[PDB]
Amino acid sequence: YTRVVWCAVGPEEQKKCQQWSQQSGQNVTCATASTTDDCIVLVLKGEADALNLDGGYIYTAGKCGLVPVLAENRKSSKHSSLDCVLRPTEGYLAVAVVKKANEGLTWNSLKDKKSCHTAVDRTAGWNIPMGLIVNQTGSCAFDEFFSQSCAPGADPKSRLCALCAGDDQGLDKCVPNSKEKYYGYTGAFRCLAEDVGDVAFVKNDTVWENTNGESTADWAKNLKREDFRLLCLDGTRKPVTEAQSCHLAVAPNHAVVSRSDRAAHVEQVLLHQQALFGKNGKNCPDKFCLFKSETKNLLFNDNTECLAKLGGRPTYEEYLGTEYVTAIANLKKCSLEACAF
Ligand SMILES: CO[C@@H]1O[C@H](CO)[C@@H](O)[C@H](O)[C@@H]1O
Ligand SMILES: [Fe+3]
Ligand SMILES: [Zn+2]
């Protein structure tokens, strides 16, 4: 029984963590850092215990000895009778999204266009699309493919940050945290929605959750699913209803990681925390909901049903899968066995 120290990325996550801390009676406390990489370092030092990470960061964390503990699980069809916490995760679909009005724009004509990315090093926003582009062009100059982009985490003076906007005051341009207007799934989709970019690399869920009244955010309230198309690898364009036949890859779900020596303790505390503040928790929506933050995906994705046990006690490599690990390794050769910190 000790507290678990969660690592929040940026000021907005910090605020949500503080609410969680208060409601949990200090069983969970908060450490804050400006980037995901800095949070990983805090965990390695033992100054923080855990945080929830996209697959691209699990790769970084894994090389440094951190392990997956529990995974985000969202609504599913198969394995219907089984409880959420025990149900296998299905993974999400990485897609490339454009405006219907941008006619004749296909996977094969993306060169020199404007792109919107969740963040550098993330699965749907970066690793998958850039990995595919590097291959198809046979060049490590992915910094040269698009004319301008917003890829949070890149050099703020480079073309890869040209479209990023910063915070209400125009500060923190291109920072890889929610202070940057176009950061993350929602941010990259907004970058496309506002016609700042020509293409957004996000997941299939992002399109649905931010269209047809699903989001009441000022920029999203008038967005219609029909005004968007997905780019398929075969050069065609399809409606967003066809994601199962028109995606770039299937990605492993975001997951909670911790130091191996702390895994058992983190797992215990989190399972109890979700019984109190999760999907149908004792205190949600009454007092506090761990999986809500108004489409902002703070700490956890808003569409998370529960955190699920893994099973087979997988290493980070088995969790990510050989097909994804080799993809990252090859892309990493552009810009092999050691912790990068
Ligand atoms: C997509 O499923 C994954 O496949 C890889 C094989 O690369 C395994 O290591 C892992 O446990 C999972 O079953
Ligand atoms: Fe992701
Ligand atoms: Zn597929």
Ligand SMILES: [Zn+2]
């Ligand atoms: Zn194993």
